[PDB]
Design a protein around this ligand. Structure first.
Ligand SMILES: Cc1ncc(C[n+]2csc(CCOP(=O)(O)OP(=O)(O)O)c2C)c(N)n1
Ligand SMILES: Cc1ncc(C[n+]2csc(CCOP(=O)(O)OP(=O)(O)O)c2C)c(N)n1
Ligand SMILES: [Cl-]
Ligand SMILES: [Cl-]
Ligand SMILES: [K+]
Ligand SMILES: [K+]
Ligand SMILES: [K+]
Ligand SMILES: [K+]
Ligand SMILES: [Mn+2]
Ligand SMILES: [Mn+2]
Lengths: 369, 329, 369, 329
């Protein structure tokens, strides 16, 4: 054949290509449910200090989740999304990145910030919309962002960050300084048109990007049987020319290994990689705790002491976040554009005049002045 | 008037409209994200069990797909009732709504149409929805000939307007004010009834000023009328616009010819908001009757904020203050 | 593994899945470039009358293309898109459909209408926007549609018809009357978000639809190397759980066989099929002519006579189309909604008043009154 | 005034702006459908050869992708100049423009932004473009705080406004009137220069009536002014708005305070068109000066037709007739 669109032989018999969904792309695992290394050649032999950091980051996230989830049930904060089941995918992948690699994500990625030492005060400040929030209290809770830790502010519309992350990776390639971009999304979000845009652009424009899909079998009430009919998200990658792998998201070491290798090759080759990590909507924290015990790197006393210390640190941040004022109401008008248009300043002045007269009817009490 | 009623909140009235539709129209189907288990705001509870999984079903998470798919169902003549989970997430479907659904009948010379499509979606602020759970996108759609955009103010109004949208032979967007879903109930007829599209409702007669709004904002202006009567001795005519396009120009102009003053209010941002269309039209038709400039009391020209919501919304005090100034002009 | 999102074994070694792009999905062919049947078991043994209809439909389309392309060069019509290289894909696939199967397409699908006996007068009427146009002169040329022949009016925005065609197929499934939908698009259009929407919805909602992608290696100036990096469009189908095949688009019999089988199985099974037909931007008409000659079903005299007859029929339709008036200018206002809103009627009345006063400045001359 | 000039048509002026940008800003890249060979309207001819395939390059055929990708480039601080091949095909990107680009800076508290994004796209009618080659989508974007929308009337104006958009620290949509691409040339400085955003231009002073338009429609109103002077002895002040948002309220209001009459014209449909925003604002600020109702002479509320285009557009006779009536009010 001489067709520019594809490289292929002729065939003289009619045969449809059948998807292999029953025995799909296999699930990479490094340690079993008892925390035992299955294949010694795959063990990353991470040092004790690093592995303890993985463990303490996951558990501290879980401690914070418990407390803020209760806070939401009481109406103290307006909204919350937990990280349960996703602690391993996020802490294991973050540990495989360079500190300056740029992260795009959505609602399940707080562990990446936790691994990057994002202060508990600032997670709290965003959920309370208080004066310490660098986001100025403008977005709903858990819409985190940090310029200093290269974690692009989350937005609620699903999958919009996917083609954006590809553009930032293209820009990085041109800047030539050995940086990758990672982009997280769920298997529901992968149904969006913007996923097809980002996967294809990353391949044709040769971008150093890791796409990290978390597949937990559900998008709200929708099981994956109603979400797609191919072999999950990993089987889509090769159709776009993207190197792809599936991993056990309850295994921090399998997540770490795949992310480390994808990062190495993405940067060297300027080509995208897709990791689909399977999780549940057999927990990553339990599995890693079993591993620590086998190495002699943890025990019940240390576990007790860290449970106590971590609860104390979260409660200290929590109480302080609740007692801080909210930002000045003037801040509802800045940053719409970089400058403030004169007509927008006129609207700001109109609010200031309004509050002078009718202020008793507004909660001016816990807003900064 | 309409047979037996029962108390229903706005979500229950939407379920009643949908139930009535599926019962009387064997072609009708309902689909979107998470509708099968009853929806994230309970609007489709019980409907799958009652009508079948082929008729009430979940789609993949893809708004451009949901609208495209709905248009195709409607091209065959079947009634397609699509859900978009929040109006904030209607934008991925903007091309399918504006370039396709609105233009389908015109561009084919009426050989094809998608008149049997309705897109329903939660709308408006909710106290803490911030940028992406709060939006009021009706002015974006108002500039698109070929679609209708309809917004109710209550459970009774919602069921009659939604049944009209489903039965109307044109693609309709029906925006359900989400802050009303579990607000107060009212009596709603159990059997089907219709409220006409492109027809405003004068809910209170008045002589000094006309007030126009839609959705939850009707209740704000109703309260503003009460404040103006008590504090200023001013008589307000309160109008619910109900249909954004095609809108009821005549009812609004008749009112303003009588009162000589108009205040329009909506949650959506001022600039390019639908108040600008009403104001410009009323000015054209009622110029010589205008005692004062038409006032627009709208959301600010910002995205919709989280912590700042109480300061952002065109509340009764903002409306009242503007009204006081207009009365004094 | 126990993950709801995929059915797969564990693997204990890290291995990325590599796309096979160098030896892609093979290209199904029935006859060679000399019109010879390659594998007798694949020959559809279509009867003489039907095969002559395929040939005469392709050539009549080509005759019309030549004339209307010249008409466009002269500014007699405002725009034209030819069917060169696409005559076989369209006539071969149309012949495999039932007459009532619903067709969605875009700019290269006039052969489907030609096979369905769409009158030359009506192709012309649409390109001239004259009084005979059932589209009322409202769309640019080649935006054909026919309710009587189940061919949904074309629209200019690429790929929008793809998720629509899936919705019409779902509706057909519910109506239970053994009908398929076919949806045509190019390999450029397949990059749109709406392609990802339609392929996925058709699989998860189990729709009797044939997706027919024409891959000619280019979208305007863009070669496929800049369009995608996987193995064309056919390799995408299995990722969505869609049965997929690639065929030689210069071979009407390979197109016909694949379309016939996809239709049979789509209707029986309520499942989507994807056919990617490879074409050039070795011609389908030449190849079929060679076949006819081998059967003793055509010769030079018949070829000459049909060239003459077909030119005559096209020129007769052409001259008549040019001499018809355009529709009444009032028709610019109807069908915006089914009814005309009063405010829209007011705009119509304003135009009528305007023309009463300023009509000398408008081309009222060749518009109907 | 601005150094050496040469005659340029509007497409050539766009190439000049782009060339100047790439020469002085090493971060800048240009991308979209078919831009590498020079573009379907020749606006990028020669730029790939001059600046490199990594800087002027084709994307896959996916508008939502083009805008998303551009936003990501801009998040890193690099200048991203995206093309959308016709403004009619901007709608697939509406969600990325409205929910993402416009809100990027606000929602992050200025931790991130995409200020270095410009989206350029051919716009407006062209004689035979029909529904999808003709559209003027500016009113859809006008209702979105956080983007700027800019439309030039000529080659000189296009290069200075486009350079301003590329350099402005906010995401900009620049609409190029395609019917002007190969229309008359004028002298255009070869070196970079800027024309300010959010600034209207009074191109002819007048005393009796203010006329406002943008794009090709500026030339229509310029001719209307000439017709009104000759046929009616009426003196028209002709204003090019240039930036749709944020718009220059002050210049328009100053003019209307002087003249007491305003006629706004645009190709886009009347209902929800940007004339409604200008009219409502001017009415609010200049109420006591208004001698006559503000007139809007716009496209009809239909999709944009093929064969009927001569009857659809708000041409000089439609504008003149409306003006005559307003002068007589
Ligand atoms: C465009 C858009 N549509 C719908 C939603 C509503 N929504 C918020 S989360 C969610 C499910 C997402 O599922 P998935 O991507 O699988 O992530 P998971 O919640 O399982 O981690 C939906 C539909 C949204 N935020 N954006
Ligand atoms: C949404 C959209 N974007 C861009 C265009 C402009 N356009 C018209 S045809 C075309 C190329 C289409 O290529 P392909 O789908 O491969 O079909 P082919 O022309 O090769 O048959 C483009 C970009 C369009 N019509 N719609
Ligand atoms: Cl959400
Ligand atoms: Cl086109
Ligand atoms: K997002
Ligand atoms: K309808
Ligand atoms: K189309
Ligand atoms: K900019
Ligand atoms: Mn999920
Ligand atoms: Mn092509």
């Amino acid at each position: 054949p001489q067709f520019p669109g594809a490289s292929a032989e002729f065939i003289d018999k009619l045969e449809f290509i059948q998807p292999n969904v029953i025995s799909g792309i296999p699930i990479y695992r490094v340690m079993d449910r008892q925390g035992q290394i299955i294949n010694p050649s795959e063990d990353p032999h991470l040092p004790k200090e690093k592995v303890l950091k993985l463990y303490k980051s996951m558990t501290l996230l879980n401690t914070m989740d418990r407390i803020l989830y209760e806070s939401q049930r009481q109406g103290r904060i307006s909204f919350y999304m937990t990280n349960y089941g996703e602690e391993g995918t996020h802490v294991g992948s973050a540990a495989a990145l360079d500190n300056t690699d740029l992260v795009f994500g959505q609602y399940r990625e707080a562990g990446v910030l936790m691994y990057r030492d994002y202060p508990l005060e600032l997670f709290m400040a965003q959920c309370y919309g208080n004066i310490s929030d660098l986001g100025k209290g403008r977005q709903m809770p858990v819409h985190y962002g940090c310029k200093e830790r290269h974690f692009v502010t989350i937005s609620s519309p699903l999958a919009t960050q996917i083609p954006q992350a590809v553009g930032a990776a293209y820009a990085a390639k041109r800047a030539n300084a050995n940086r990758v971009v990672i982009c997280y999304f769920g298997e529901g979000a992968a149904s969006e048109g913007d996923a097809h845009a980002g996967f294809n652009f990353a391949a044709t424009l040769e971008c150093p990007i890791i796409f990290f899909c978390r597949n937990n079998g559900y998008a709200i009430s929708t099981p994956t049987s109603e979400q797609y009919r191919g072999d999950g998200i990993a089987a889509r990658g090769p159709g776009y020319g993207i190197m792809s792998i599936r991993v056990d998201g309850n295994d921090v070491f399998a997540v770490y290994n795949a992310t480390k290798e994808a990062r190495r090759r993405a940067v060297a080759e300027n080509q995208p990689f897709l990791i689909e990590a399977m999780t549940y909507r057999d927990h990553p924290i339990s599995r890693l705790r079993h591993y620590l015990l086998s190495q002699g790197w943890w025990d019940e006393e240390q576990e007790k002491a860290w449970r106590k210390q971590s609860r104390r640190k979260v409660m200290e941040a929590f109480e302080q976040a609740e007692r801080k004022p909210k930002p000045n109401p003037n801040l509802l008008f800045s940053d719409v554009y970089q400058e403030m248009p004169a007509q927008l300043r006129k609207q700001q002045e109109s609010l200031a005049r309004h509050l002078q007269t009718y202020g008793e009817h507004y909660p001016l009490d816990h807003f900064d002045k | 008037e309409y047979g037996q009623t029962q108390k229903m909140n706005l979500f229950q009235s939407v379920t009643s409209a949908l139930d009535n539709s599926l019962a009387k129209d064997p072609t009708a189907v309902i689909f979107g994200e998470d509708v099968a288990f009853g929806g994230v705001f309970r609007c489709t509870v019980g409907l799958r069990d009652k009508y079948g999984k082929d008729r009430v079903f979940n789609t993949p998470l893809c708004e451009q797909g949901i609208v495209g798919f709905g248009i195709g169902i409607a091209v065959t003549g079947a009634t397609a009732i699509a859900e978009i989970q929040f109006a904030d997430y209607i934008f991925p479907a903007f091309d399918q709504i504006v370039n396709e659904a609105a233009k389908y009948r015109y561009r084919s010379g009426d050989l094809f149409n998608c008149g049997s499509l309705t897109i329903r979606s939660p709308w408006g602020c909710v106290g803490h929805g911030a940028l992406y759970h709060s939006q009021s996108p009706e002015a974006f759609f108002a500039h698109c000939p070929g679609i209708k955009v309809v917004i109710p103010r209550s459970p009774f109004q919602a069921k009659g307007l939604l049944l009209s949208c489903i039965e109307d032979k044109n693609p309709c967007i029906f925006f359900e004010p989400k802050i009303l879903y579990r607000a107060a109930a009212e009596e709603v007829p159990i059997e089907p009834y219709n409220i006409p599209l492109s027809q405003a409702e004068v809910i209170q007669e008045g002589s000094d000023v006309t007030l126009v709004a839609w959705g939850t904002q009707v209740h704000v202006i109703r309260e503003v009328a009460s404040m103006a009567k008590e504090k200023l001795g001013v008589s307000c005519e309160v109008i619910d616009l109900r249909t954004i396009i095609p809108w009821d120009v005549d009812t609004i102009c008749k009112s303003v010819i009588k009162t000589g003053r108009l205040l329009i209010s909506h949650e959506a941002p001022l600039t390019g908001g639908f108040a600008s269309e009403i104001s410009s039209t009323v000015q054209e038709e009622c110029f010589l009757n205008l005692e004062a400039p038409i006032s627009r009391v709208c959301g600010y020209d910002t995205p919709f904020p989280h912590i700042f919501e109480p300061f952002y919304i065109p509340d009764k005090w903002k409306c009242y203050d503007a009204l006081r100034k207009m009365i004094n002009y």
